[PDB]
């Protein structure tokens, strides 16, 4: 166990950042021109 | 303001507003089944799998 959640926080932040990157990419693509 | 006009026009639909209330039946015919299906999906998934 070791009651360590740094890995959980890292992977959660990674997937969240990827999702937000995709959505802001869509927003920027729409907003261009 | 820049990239849109009138602040409100951009953030509301106060333009024009009526007509849609007559087609309220047509809206409801597909609105209510979709809402009930969504409720069933979320309820059953939560109570069977996430618990």
């Amino acid at each position: 166990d070791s009651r360590d959640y740094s890995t959980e926080l890292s992977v959660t932040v990674a997937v969240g950042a990827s999702l937000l990157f995709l959505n802001i990419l869509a927003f920027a693509a729409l907003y261009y021109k | 303001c820049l990239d849109g006009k009138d602040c409100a026009s951009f953030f509301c639909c106060f333009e024009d507003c009526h007509i849609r209330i007559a087609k309220m039946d047509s809206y409801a015919r597909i609105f209510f089944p979709t809402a009930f299906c969504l409720f069933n999906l979320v309820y059953w998934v939560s109570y069977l799998y996430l618990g």
């Binding site: 009651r3 969240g16 999702l19 959505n23 802001i24 | -």
Partner: protein, 188 residues
């Protein structure tokens, strides 16, 4: 128009993803956790919470449900759960109005979800801001430590669900803005 339709489909898919995230963070209890400097192991969510039994960390008991407000540790927890539930209801209102895209005009439906997603985002922010107020409760203090208190994590550590809720807040804000821009576009 092709790009507008593709962006609309992507927006709908990301809205459904945000709704899934909202449901998961509401239901799951892994908002706050335990560290090596903790009196006992455990973790508590908005209304649910599990704590260890005996000296051994194994065989931890669980208690709390939204339907039973008698078991929720504090009114702050109750309010946070209520606000997150309101966010769920509003985003599901959008996923229903995806049906209304059939008949009503696209700009109007897009603006309707833009406002509803904004309201869901505000409800989720209010819930996430009100939730830490309840850490002064007796059970939370016993699980975490004496240092724990109002807006003070103390010896406990945040788990994945809380940061996932923050990510959901950001996603809801940006999705609401995207919906507003889509509604104001493709109508001239």
């Amino acid at each position: 128009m092709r790009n507008s339709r593709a962006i609309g489909v992507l927006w709908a898919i990301f809205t459904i993803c945000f709704a899934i995230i909202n449901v998961v963070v509401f239901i799951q209890p892994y908002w706050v956790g335990d560290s090596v400097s903790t009196p006992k192991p455990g973790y508590f969510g908005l209304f649910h919470y599990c704590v260890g039994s005996g000296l051994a960390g194994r065989e931890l008991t669980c208690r709390g449900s939204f339907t039973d407000f008698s078991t929720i540790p504090s009114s702050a927890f109750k309010a946070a759960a209520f606000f997150v539930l309101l966010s769920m209801v509003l985003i599901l209102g959008c996923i229903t109005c995806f049906s209304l895209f059939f008949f009503c005009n696209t700009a109007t439906v897009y603006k309707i979800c833009a406002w509803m997603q904004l309201l869901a985002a505000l409800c989720l922010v209010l819930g996430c801001m009100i939730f830490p107020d309840g850490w002064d409760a007796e059970t939370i203090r016993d699980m975490c430590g004496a240092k724990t208190g109002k807006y003070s994590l103390g010896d406990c550590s945040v788990r994945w669900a809380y940061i996932l809720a923050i990510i959901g807040i950001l996603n809801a804000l940006i999705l609401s803005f995207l919906a507003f821009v889509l509604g104001n576009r493709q109508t001239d």
